[PDB]
Symmetry: D2
Subunit: 233 residues, 4 copies
């Protein structure tokens, strides 16, 4: 299986598998069962912004989600990512839909990682996406539309979101997030998203994640498993 | 008085005023009495590197000091800097010497701050310093030498450090580290230093600090007070 | 007098003083009489974007102005800026109005300069401006409005532009754009603007400029002189 | 065949194929026969630095090579790279040796490309290289040594350079250097190198190049052809 670290924007509460009884954002460390979660006042229909940051010294993975002119949602979890993730990784975005749906549009995405022992670094940012982006590995249904937006999950020609869909987008170049005796390593990511839906209770969510470089959509990882895990353990 | 936040590289143990009985690095929040300290295996004579980072979401000020081919020293303190510092600040470097001395040479210094509500930012970096640097506010004895290094404390023409000296260097432009309803704010700083000394027990240390924009060397802030505070409260 | 280098977005054709008989953008080197100009298809009422770049090796100052979904305007001039500008400078934005008016709103502004001999650098960017920005030197009428925009020239409470106005905004920290034996130096700047006007022929324009660090609005530098020069020589 | 743009640090004068009768750096546009060259006061044994920059507005490819405490070598060529290169490319470093040899060690390499229509970007930098770098495509003999240096051409266990060797290193992620109606696109690259040799006349050189994303070492592209072209046309 893969090794996964992620910040989930969980729109549908799957109380049966540990999820709180309300939309939320959480930090997942090798398990869909978030190590930490926080109430997310979902603004279906409005453009949101997610910011994720971490550094090997403070060892505190944090994330904040906001919408113009409205309070933000934040979540943090203390953990030394060097204990979880391998030295070389690929970073990406994933999203799913199940019985209930929603659009999982990504309008922009930037990422920066630095490894000091000087200081090697990788930084990329898309304010728009082109169809057939050669610097992205699109998995599942994920695709880029004519507007320059990244649709992680299927969206009809009418723009209507489809259920039971899954997709991911990984940056092409692997990233060296750590090495023995490195002095400090850090990474920061930001993405803007647009979740729309005709459903009274939209599902399932969007995530920013980091995994082994050969990561792929696990068998039956749809719906409540945000396309990151094979099961709910 | 000033409002000060700092990461101190305390070379001399002043046990009388809270200091541990060994060289150390610490985080000071409006008091020379560090809120958190860690043992610093001082490498007198070798070039060291300090890295300081913080973001408004994780709210954890961290710092790591290292030397080539040798373990590093780290220290962190959980605190919401928005509660301590004013919205506009100036960042700088300070250093002192008392009865016992040491050189407090700065070879390079970089700093980055971002404020998102987009994202305003300020970034500067010196790999060398020119004499009469117009983008630095030099306070006390602090000066730039012919080699392009910043000498925070007095150093004889022979290169010998002098005791009872104090100096600071602030970046010229004020920095807006926070604003109401900002989504996230962060800053990161790095500097390389060279502390040399003929003394068996060198003093007193070097700090990276953030304070009110009109900050200045407090009356009798020399020696064990690292040129940041008027007293030891 | 001051030493000035600038990229002018000249909205009003002052044919009497060398100006072409149409709105234009030009590169000015110590003279309002541009060394090079190009036809500017002014989009009064729409948000424009200006990008200015230069490096000591290619020695070619360039600038491009564009508006969404419409062709751009470009202008270049080969010149070694080390022959014109002093080693330390301040960069800024200026704008004016005369008999005829227009708003000269700046929505964002970023700047980056690098000097290698390593590589010292300065970078700042505002996606919004706060009233009473401590990292800007506002000259003349220039002010920040409640929306977070920079109004270089007077704008009535109703938003109506006023004639015979002048204003400039300089970044606070001086910039070291060059030093003897430097290997390469470069700078890049971008700003977005909004020029509105009830006039059939709006005036006078907006500029990005670089000058001596103590530069100020020259006596009677209003109107066609874009607040940069004392006369039209 | 491939589409190649490159800055060559040509250490051996192959006068028969257009080369000047002295070591030189040049800009090659789809031909080993440089469109522009300049005398290179080669400092065999000392660490050199190369800086390459270009932007779609000025349309002037430039490069400068220097060594500590000694004059630099510069070369420029006016050309709209959008006419030569395809929209998606891969950037890299290449080097060769023929009858005569030299080491072609790369100590660091950074690259930045921006495409505005906002502003997509890619930036990476290595201050050291790890063996088996997953974010580099190593071609030919190119390899990373235990010191963290990139050896483009074969170097014996004793550190002695070998003749008749060729190698290249490409960054893993493709780069989108241009798109229709883009406002401005730019790229900048820097690398430090170490060329050593026991030969009275070392060969053959090092280059930074940009080519089609599937570029590879052309058949018999060794020696004077710097591993970029199949012939000398
Ligand atoms: Mn970098
Ligand atoms: Mn951040
Ligand atoms: Mn319901
Ligand atoms: Mn910035
Ligand atoms: Mn950092
Ligand atoms: Mn002792
Ligand atoms: Mn920099
Ligand atoms: Mn640019
Ligand atoms: Mn008219
Ligand atoms: Mn970028
Ligand atoms: Mn450059
Ligand atoms: Mn010879």
């Amino acid at each position: 299986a893969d090794t996964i670290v992620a910040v989930e924007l969980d729109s549908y509460p799957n109380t049966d598998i540990g999820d709180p009884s309300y939309p939320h954002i959480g930090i997942d460390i090798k398990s869909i069962r978030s190590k930490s979660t926080a109430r997310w006042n979902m603004q279906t229909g409005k453009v949101g912004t997610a910011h994720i940051s971490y550094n090997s010294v403070a060892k505190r993975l944090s994330a904040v989600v906001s919408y113009t002119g409205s309070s933000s949602t934040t979540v943090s979890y203390d953990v030394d990512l060097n204990n979880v993730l391998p030295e070389w990784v690929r970073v990406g975005l994933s999203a799913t839909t199940g019985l209930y749906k929603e659009t999982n549009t990504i309008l922009s995405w930037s990422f920066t990682s630095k490894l000091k022992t000087d200081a090697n670094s990788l930084h990329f940012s898309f304010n728009q996406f082109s169809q057939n982006p050669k610097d992205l590995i699109l998995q599942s249904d994920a695709t880029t539309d004519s507007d320059g937006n990244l649709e992680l999950t299927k969206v009809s020609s009418s723009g209507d979101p489809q259920g039971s869909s899954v997709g991911r987008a990984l940056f092409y170049a692997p990233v060296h997030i750590w090495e023995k005796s490195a002095v400090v390593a850090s990474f920061d990511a930001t993405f803007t998203f647009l979740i729309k839906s005709p459903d009274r209770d939209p599902a399932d969510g969007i995530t920013f994640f980091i995994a082994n470089t050969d990561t792929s959509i696990p068998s039956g990882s749809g719906g409540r498993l945000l396309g990151l895990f094979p099961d709910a353990n």
